[PDB]
Every structure is written in structure tokens, then in C-alpha cells.
């Protein structure tokens, strides 16, 4: 179909004995201008003459009592729908680029084994495994501090927990705030020091680290990542000129939140390069035809049948040794024979895993992945400079701009942990809004990110909440939505097909440790 045209809209919003107002015609005129736009592309179709909504919302704020309001309100609904027809019927090929991120430490072999599976089936794709060459010791310095944060916590605790994690975060913040002052100072005296220089100096002075054996970890980390596809380094001239950089350095150096710096990187790299981002815990999709002859038992969850598939493929083909048969080893030999026979009747990796190939997506969209708890950015697809990718970056940029207008005042007062939290909570409660009510609540937990349970701030800043907020800005014809009011059935429009990714891997299945009440006093017993 299409959208309603000028004659049609004239029928809907007609009121007998009521002439056409100056602004009512502005809507009819722009709508007619729209349907004479076949020579134009998708992007400037979406705005140049597909706002309309603007000229419509103008009519409803001038003539608040007009009869046509009820009809034009439905007209705005047909505009959201036409945007989805635009997204689904005009698709261009996607850049054959695959993006991974490993920053802060040495890449371990399990991550390389998962990446090598994408290269073998998709031999027509560039593989970039982004790393920060200047910050290999950010994971090393994070461990050292919390290690020492417990030695000093238990030193003054001669008689529980809760009070443990409470009085531990106070120490971590002081050792954190101490390092940030050393960094901001070292960078002033010597602008030529990189992050790694400052960290091995701080780790050697205040923690007696064999710095002889530290510059070895740096040499091995680069030698490893550089011969495994690499295609990266702290390069990116367009990422460093962009406003999103000192946001990434803030989560990296001032915060030691390795993942939150990756959340900022992935969406910016997709917008500037194009391609498809994946966490290193993801595996290529399985050929949909492979195990159709092995009926799944009706007394078994769907997730179980999904992991057992990958575990079987890794048992009789051994692409990845040391992959657990943990879930496969619980079927009778009547069923394990069904897998071994099917894994015999294939002889190539691309007979088992589906390749991506010539993918295509819309210039407006950024395709996001799904699980049981909503959208998740363990897999993203976007064409270069897609309209959604720009909205997600402005959304994350806008959300951090809010975070720092209230947090940086309290950091500058250099008090302890609790006086700084009280100053920071009032500042978000001051410049608070009725729109961002759901947002500013999760913001108060920001200092505890990485060191406590029940902290959902990272999600509301540069995670799923920001992506959905960008999808709303797309579908509501606005920018800067803070309160999500899109239903789940709406967001599945930007879903990534289950046959392009394999999520139930051993790895991202092994990163579901709850760390809450189901822990109960434990882990402290480890500390001996």
C-alpha cells in the first residue's frame, strides 16, 4: 500500500461548513509534496517531507477545539506506520565488516576461538577486533585495587557482610579518587604520557609491582592481538574528533568500567564504518536445515535444546576443543546417535554454520538483538551513517551530559564516599524532571557500578535503555526521549534474526551469575 494522499486526508478531516485554515492546508500541501518523491532516497524521504507530524501538531496546538483534531490524531498514527513501511521495503547492502572489542587486558584464547569461527564461515568479511593500545593495564589496575581494598577492609574488622561491601566501597572510591588526581596531574606536567605509562608508574610506586614483569604483559598483549586479525588500535580519527571520546575515556580511566567504555565504542564504530558488532561470546548461526530430523523432546526447555546443538557440533567436529558437553552428556545414546550420524553426513564448517553473505538493511535502522529479557546489544547491525546510529549516539551523549552536570560538582569537592553521594543525589534530584523520573532513579547508583549488587545504572546510560530511547525518537518524530513508552511488540521491528547469531554459547551462558540474595554471606569465606 502507501500512506493516505491529499484527497484522502481531505475526506478524513473534512468538517462540513468549515473552510480550510492556513495551517490545515500546510499539512495537505506537504503531504501532496511527499507522494511526488519517488526520485528521492529513504533518509531524506523520512524527514524532508515526512515530518508532517510537525505541521499536524501545529494545527492541534492552534485550534485546540477544532473538529478535525480527532481525525488528524489518527493521521499521525498512519505516519508511524509509513515509517515502518519505509524501513521494510527499501534495503541497501551492508558493509562486510565484523566488529569486536577487547580493551583493558590481554585477549584470552576462548575469545579468539569464538572469533575464529566467524572468520572461517564468513571468509568475505573484514574482522576488526578493536583494542586500546594505550590501556592494557586497566584490567590489571582494577584487580590490584580491590585486592588491596579487602586486605585493608579485613584489617579493621576484628569481631556479617553487607557492612563488608559497604565499608569496602569507601576504600575503593578513595583509592579510585586518589588515582584520578594522580592522572589529571601527570597529564598536566607531561602531556606525552599515555594511560599505560601512568598506570605502571602508579602500580609500581604504591603497590610494589615488579614493573620489570609489567612491561612484559604489555608486549605479550599486543603481540597476541596484532596477529589475531587486529584491524584496530587507538586509531579512529573520526572517533577522537567526535564528542563521544572523553565519554569513553571517562568509563575507561576515571571509572575502570571496561564494558561501559565498549558500549560507547561499538555504536560509534558502527555509525562510522558500517557492518555488524558482536560480543566475543557469540557464535555464527546454525544452518536451519541441520537438526530438523531430530525431534526435540516435549519434556525439555527450548534453551536446553539450543545449547545441546552447539555442544554436539563441538563434540563430533571439535572446531573448539574444551567446549563443554555439559548439556549433551544428559541424553540417551538413542539420541546421541542421532547427532553423531548427522554430524557425520557433513564435511565442511559452512555446511554446519550459516554464513552472513550479502546482508541488507535500511538506511534508517540499526538492527538489535533479542533475548528473554528484552533488547540486548550483544549484536548490532547498521549501514554506515544510518539514521538510527546517529540517534543512539546523540542519546548516549545526551544521557552522559545529564550524568556529569550533577556528578562533577560533587567530585570537585573531594569529600569521602558518602558526602560525595549525598551531594550527587541532591544534584540529580534538583535538576530533575517529570519526564526522566524512571531515569534519574537508576542514576543515583552510578558510583557503585562494578562493585555492588542491584545496580542497573550501566543499562540506563549506554545500554538497552539508550537504544530503545533512540528507537522512540525515530518512531515519534522527535529527539531526546527519556521515558520509554514503546511496547515490546513495537521494538521487535528492529530484531536480528535468530539464524544470523547463536546466542546460547557456553560463554554468554556462563555470564549470568546473579550476585544478590542467592549468594547469602558467601564469597566472604573465600577471603582468607
Amino acid at each position, epitope marked *: 500500500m502507501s500512506l493516505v494522499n491529499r484527497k484522502q486526508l481531505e475526506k478524513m478531516a473534512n468538517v462540513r461548513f468549515r473552510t480550510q485554515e492556513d495551517e490545515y492546508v500546510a499539512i495537505l500541501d506537504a503531504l501532496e509534496e511527499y507522494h511526488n518523491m519517488s526520485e528521492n532516497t529513504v533518509v531524506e524521504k523520512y524527514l524532508k517531507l515526512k515530518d508532517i507530524n510537525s505541521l499536524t501538531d501545529i494545527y492541534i496546538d492552534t485550534y485546540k477545539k477544532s473538529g478535525r483534531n480527532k481525525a488528524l490524531k489518527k493521521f499521525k498514527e498512519y505516519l508511524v506506520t509509513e515509517v515502518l513501511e519505509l524501513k521494510n521495503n527499501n534495503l541497501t*547492502p551492508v*558493509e*562486510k*565488516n565484523l566488529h569486536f572489542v577487547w580493551i583493558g587486558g590481554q585477549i584470552n584464547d576462548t575469545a579468539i576461538n569464538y572469533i575464529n569461527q566467524w572468520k572461517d564461515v564468513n*571468509s*568475505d*568479511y*573484514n574482522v*576488526n577486533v578493536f583494542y586500546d593500545s594505550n590501556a592494557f593495564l586497566i584490567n590489571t589496575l582494577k584487580k590490584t585495587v580491590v585486592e588491596s581494598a579487602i586486605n585493608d577492609t579485613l584489617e579493621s574488622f576484628r569481631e556479617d557482610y553487607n557492612k563488608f561491601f559497604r565499608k569496602r566501597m569507601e576504600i575503593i572510591y578513595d583509592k579510585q579518587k586518589n588515582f584520578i588526581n594522580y592522572y589529571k596531574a601527570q597529564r598536566e606536567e607531561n602531556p606525552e604520557l599515555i594511560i599505560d605509562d601512568i598506570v605502571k608508574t602508579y602500580l609500581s610506586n604504591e603497590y610494589s609491582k615488579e614493573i620489570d614483569e609489567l612491561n612484559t604483559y604489555i608486549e605479550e598483549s599486543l603481540n597476541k592481538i596484532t596477529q589475531n586479525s587486529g*584491524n*584496530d588500535v587507538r*586509531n*579512529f580519527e573520526e572517533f577522537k574528533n567526535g564528542e563521544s571520546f572523553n565519554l569513553y575515556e571517562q568509563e575507561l580511566v576515571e571509572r575502570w568500567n571496561l564494558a561501559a567504555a565498549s558500549d560507547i565504542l561499538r555504536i560509534s*564504530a558502527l555509525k562510522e*564504518i*558500517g557492518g555488524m558488532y558482536l560480543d566475543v561470546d557469540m557464535l555464527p548461526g546454525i544452518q536451519p536445515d541441520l537438526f530438523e530430523s531430530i525431534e526435540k523432546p516435549s519434556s525439555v526447555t527450548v534453551d536446553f535444546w539450543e545449547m545441546t546443538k552447539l555442544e554436539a557440533i563441538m563434540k563430533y567436529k571439535e572446531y573448539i576443543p574444551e567446549y563443554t558437553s555439559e548439556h549433551f552428556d544428559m541424553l540417551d545414546e538413542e539420541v546421541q546417535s542421532s547427532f553423531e550420524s548427522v554430524l557425520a553426513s557433513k564435511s*565442511d564448517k*559452512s555446511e554446519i554454520f*550459516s*554464513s*552472513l*553473505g*550479502d546482508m*541488507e538493511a535500511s538506511p534508517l535502522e540499526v538492527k538489535i538483538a533479542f533475548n528473554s529479557k528484552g533488547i540486548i546489544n550483544q549484536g548490532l547491525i547498521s549501514v554506515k551513517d544510518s539514521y538510527c546510529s546517529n540517534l543512539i549516539v546523540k542519546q548516549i551523549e545526551n544521557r552522559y551530559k545529564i550524568l556529569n552536570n550533577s556528578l562533577n560538582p560533587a567530585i570537585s569537592e573531594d569529600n569521602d564516599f558518602n558526602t560525595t553521594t549525598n551531594t550527587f543525589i541532591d544534584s540529580i534530584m534538583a535538576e530533575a524532571n517529570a519526564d526522566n523520573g524512571r531515569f534519574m532513579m537508576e542514576l543515583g547508583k552510578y558510583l557503585r557500578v562494578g562493585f555492588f549488587p542491584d545496580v542497573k545504572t550501566t543499562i540506563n546510560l549506554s545500554g538497552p535503555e539508550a537504544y530503545a530511547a533512540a528507537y522512540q525518537d525515530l518512531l515519534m518524530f522527535k529527539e531526546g526521549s527519556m521515558n520509554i513508552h514503546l511496547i515490546e511488540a513495537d521494538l521487535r521491528n528492529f530484531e536480528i534474526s535468530k539464524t544470523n547469531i547463536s546466542q546460547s554459547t557456553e560463554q554468554e551462558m556462563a555470564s549470568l551469575w546473579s550476585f544478590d540474595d542467592a549468594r547469602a554471606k558467601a564469597q566472604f569465606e573465600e577471603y582468607k
Partner: antibody, heavy 115, light 116 residues
Framework: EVQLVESGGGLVQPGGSLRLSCAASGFTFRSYWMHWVRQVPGKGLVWVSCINKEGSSTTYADSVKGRFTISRDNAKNTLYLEMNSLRADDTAVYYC????????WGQGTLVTVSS | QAVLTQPSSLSASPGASVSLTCTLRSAINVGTYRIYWYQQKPGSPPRYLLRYKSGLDKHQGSGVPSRFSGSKDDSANAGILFISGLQSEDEADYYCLIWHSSAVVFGGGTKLTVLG
């Protein structure tokens, strides 16, 4: 191991017709676009026609517009090119190649148009 | 000129390093496209080689030696094909690609003669 083997080329009267057939193996014959490219023996490469993944839209070169038709059968993993109203210009070797950003080439079948 | 233009032919001695250019006329065209390189050793069909569009949007065909590399020299709008460590097994014809107003356009071809 991706292999593409075309056939159907031979010798035709100027004005006759031919049906070239590139058969695909080793990869998912869907998932990818396809092209036809001709090379007059002893000269450069020249593009002819290109078909979608699904065969919904197609683009032809200005030389063969109207005279040529590209066709794609995703079942029988095979591509087609139907050449009508043949000139002597069309005498060349015709290759089929794979992907939007184009990767792998075929053997090439020779087509001669002489009287 | 002609959308996308290459030199006729060039020769060099084994071991030397060469750079082929695929220039493309000025105007509605710059260096924000991909450059697809191809090698056709005579008597055989072409071989995929490289794809370079940017430092992060580059590719080398499976089996292409690491001595082949591509970049783009600005100010001249041209794409480049460095071949360092030349050998007699590299004597062939070389073509580039570009996606234009839809369709896809080739270059003239460079008859590289490695005299060994």
C-alpha cells in the same frame, strides 16, 4: 570450495538467441547477489547484468538493455542469461561472478556471433 | 574523462615495489568509495585481490599474498595497489571496480610486465 561453472555458449547467427547457465556449488546460492560480465578476448572487462538476492530488481548495461534478460533459480542452484537479438559486438567470453561486492569468478563460456 | 581510468602498462624488475593507480575522473566522484582489485594471469579468469575503502574497511582475498596492499592517494582521487617484493608470478593484467549510479564499472587494465 566455491566453484561456478557456466555453459550454453556456442556459435549463433547474428539475431539468434542463447541461454547461458551458471551452476553454483560450495556456498549458499541464496544469500548472495550474482552478475554477468563479458570479456572480448584481448580487451578489458565489461559489465553486463546484475540480479538481486531474491531476483526482485535487476540492472542491465546500456548495450544490452532490452536485448538481454537475467534470471535466477534459487532451487536448482543456477543462474541464467537469455540473449536475444545478438550482434557481433556480443562475441566474447561471459563470466558469472558472486556477491554485491564481487568475489569469485566462473570458468567462462565462449559465445561467438558470426555468419 | 572516462569515469574510472588506469594506465596502459608498466614494467619493473623482480624484487622492486610497484604501485598501480585507478584514477577515476574528478567531479561527482571522490575517494569515499571502495576500490576492488583483480588479477588475471593471461589465459585464466580474474582473481579477487583487495577491497580497501578505509583503514577499517579493507579486505584481502583468501590466498592473496600479504605483499599486496591497497590505499588511496588523495588530491589525485586515485586508488592504489602496492605490490612489494615483486616476482615473475605477478605478471598479469590488473582491473579495479567501483559501484556508481547503480551498475558497476571497470578500469582500463594495467598490463604489468615483470621481466625475469
Amino acid at each position: 570450495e566455491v566453484q561456478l561453472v557456466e555453459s550454453g555458449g556456442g556459435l549463433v547467427q547474428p539475431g539468434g538467441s542463447l541461454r547461458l547457465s551458471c551452476a553454483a556449488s560450495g556456498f549458499t546460492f541464496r544469500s548472495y547477489w550474482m552478475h554477468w560480465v563479458r570479456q572480448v578476448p584481448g580487451k578489458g572487462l565489461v559489465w553486463v547484468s546484475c540480479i538481486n538476492k531474491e531476483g526482485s530488481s535487476t540492472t542491465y548495461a546500456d548495450s544490452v538493455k532490452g536485448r538481454f534478460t537475467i534470471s535466477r533459480d534459487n532451487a536448482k542452484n543456477t543462474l541464467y542469461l537469455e540473449m536475444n537479438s545478438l550482434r557481433a559486438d556480443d562475441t566474447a567470453v561471459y563470466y558469472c561472478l558472486r556477491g554485491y561486492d564481487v568475489d569469485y569468478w566462473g570458468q567462462g563460456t565462449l559465445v561467438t556471433v558470426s555468419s | 574523462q572516462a569515469v574510472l581510468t588506469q594506465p596502459s602498462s608498466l614494467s619493473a624488475s623482480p624484487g622492486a615495489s610497484v604501485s598501480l593507480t585507478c584514477t577515476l575522473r574528478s567531479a561527482i566522484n571522490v575517494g569515499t568509495y571502495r576500490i576492488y582489485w583483480y588479477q588475471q594471469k593471461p589465459g585464466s579468469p580474474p582473481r579477487y585481490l583487495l577491497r580497501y575503502k578505509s583503514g577499517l574497511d579493507k579486505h584481502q582475498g583468501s590466498g592473496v599474498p600479504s605483499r599486496f596492499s591497497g590505499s588511496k592517494d588523495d588530491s589525485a582521487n586515485a586508488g592504489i595497489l602496492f605490490i612489494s617484493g615483486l616476482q615473475s608470478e605477478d605478471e598479469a593484467d590488473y582491473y579495479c571496480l567501483i559501484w556508481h549510479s547503480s551498475a558497476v564499472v571497470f578500469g582500463g587494465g594495467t598490463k604489468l610486465t615483470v621481466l625475469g
